[PDB]
Amino acid sequence: AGDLGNVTADKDGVADVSIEDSVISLSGDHSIIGRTLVVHEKAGAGAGSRLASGVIGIAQAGAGATKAVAVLKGDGPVQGIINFEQKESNGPVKVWGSIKGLTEGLHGFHVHGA
């Protein structure tokens, strides 16, 4: 699991994220909690990108529900906060937040090692 497509940074270097994914889970036996979220700092499909990254940490939530947060840190100004929420065990996961400092355009976005 873990592919989250690409995010799009604007001319200000801000990528607002709003995704739902049902391949990843915050629960069950293959949870992404504790995995590292990564964003390519190079725009587009080219090899040799540096990465901004952060570990997906548990946040207090409810009952069968789970919330998690990754604080992304990269080079120079790249930084962001990405939230994950899952209402029921092995249900769809909502992924949302924002990343700043990015070059304008498409950036690969995915959970590593999941």
Are 56 and 67 in contact by the 8 Å Cβ rule? The answer is: no
Alpha-carbon distance values, 7 to 20, 23, 36, 97, 98 (Å): 13, 18, 17, 11, 10
Alpha-carbon distance values, 70 to 39, 54, 101, 108 (Å): 11, 5, 16, 16
Burial code (b: 16+ CB inside 10 Å, e: under 16) for 27-50 equals beeebbeebbbbbbbbbeeeeebe
What amino acid occupies position 51?
L
User: In whole angstroms, what is the distance from residue 114 CA to residue 110 CA?
Assistant: 9
Experimental method for this entry?
Answer: X-ray
Which residues carry a binding-site annotation for Cu cation? Answer: 40, 110, 112
Which residues carry a binding-site annotation for Zn(2+)? Answer: 3
Which residues carry a binding-site annotation? Answer: 3, 40, 110, 112
Are 69 and 59 in contact by the 8 Å Cβ rule? The answer is: yes
**Stated resolution in angstroms:** 1.2
- Sign for the pseudo-dihedral over CA of 36, 102, 15, 8: negative
